[PDB]
């Protein structure tokens with residue numbers, strides 16, 4: 001025992017408000033919104049330029065057409081490093097955000113995010129034992145504190161674990177098992193809660209290649225898989241050209257340039273999106289395991305001027321509709337990655353300071369795809 005036990009009040013198993021299976025719950029969610037760069041920000045909830053989460057925001061998210069929110073949460077910076085005890089004040093703040101999301105009739109997925117990297121960048125044999133110990137200690141606390149919420153609340157054990165090979169995959173399977181056991185151990189509604197497990201690098205191709213089995217669960221039919229999606233990188237995230245490749249400003253049938261043609265895609269088009277999603281349908285969905293698509297977005301390039309900009313914006317919108325639509329058609333639940341920014345290279349579709357829509361075009365694209 002590196003750390004004390006935090007499974008200090010285990011409760012009797014409680015199935016009340018927990019009647020849905022993972023498949024049934026996935027049936028209720030078609031469009032999801034990440035509260036990005038907020039509860040996971042290093043330095044505090046407001047450290048990365050977003051205000052504290054308010055009811056008014058969650059209300060706008062609901063009223064705009066989202067069924068669910070994914071809330072990235074940081075924990076390690078709030079914990080005593082000797083004991084792994086998480087601040088009581090932080091636990092209550094997270095609980096409070098969950099409560100308000102569930103009061104606006106949203107499903108809610110809470111994780112341990114990148115979190116400064118303690119687990120995420122350490123899917124390795126040398127770190128396996130210490131990280132399991134912290135995974136267990138944190139999840140005991142988070143689950144105990146959030147135990148009484150009904151099936152509107154789901155937990156995801158990690159964010160984007162960096163497992164690049166079979167030996168790292170084995171370590172990841174260990175981290176994911178530690179998460180399930182920790183949560184189930186607390187009892188209460190946590191005996192039945194739907195949990196979400198992440199694939200290697202949350203990458204479709206690597207998941208298809210390395211994923212072996214789901215963790216063992218004392219509960220029946222209560223697990224989902226998770227991947228993320230930024231294909232093609234050159235369009236969605238790349239901000240400068242490199243020796244290895246050029247940025248794409250434009251994407252989709254009908255929105256390609258004839259003037260700056262080096263800025264059209266050379267890969268990662270519709271057929272590729274289709275092919276990648278079909279891998280997750282076969283590995284998971286077709287086997288009765290839904291798949292959460294926890295993170296996707298193509299950033300805005302507002303450093304373009306004139307018809308270049310207009311064309312980028314059209315393709316950028318279509319990209320979000322196509323991903324949303326083609327993911328839903330295959331049993332993946334799309335959660336848009338929103339960082340709150342309204343400036344160049346950002347992904348915020350709301351203006352968080354005013355509780356209004358900043359990017360109506362991408363909002364409509366998402367809803368149409370939905």
Ligand SMILES: *[C@H]1O[C@H](CO)[C@@H](O[C@@H]2O[C@H](CO[C@H]3OC[C@@H](O)[C@H](O)[C@H]3O)[C@@H](O[C@@H]3O[C@H](CO[C@H]4OC[C@@H](O)[C@H](O)[C@H]4O)[C@@H](O[C@@H]4O[C@H](CO)[C@@H](O)[C@H](O)[C@H]4O)[C@H](O)[C@H]3O)[C@H](O)[C@H]2O)[C@H](O)[C@H]1F
Nearest residue numbers: 037047048049114159160295337339340341342343344346
């Ligand atoms: C899936 O991928 C998503 C897309 O990459 C991830 O979201 C992105 O997260 C990074 C944080 O990265 C850490 O967590 C993820 C790990 O994979 C990384 O290895 C870690 O480094 C965010 O970057 C942070 O952004 C904040 C906020 O400001 C920026 O973003 C908003 C935009 O409007 C603005 O123009 C950007 O400047 C940065 O905080 C600011 O920093 C400056 C400089 O010190 C300071 O003046 C500001 O006051 C301060 O607010 C921060 O330094 C930067 O790391 C991405 O914005 C986010 O999209 C997702 O986490 C992953 F799971």
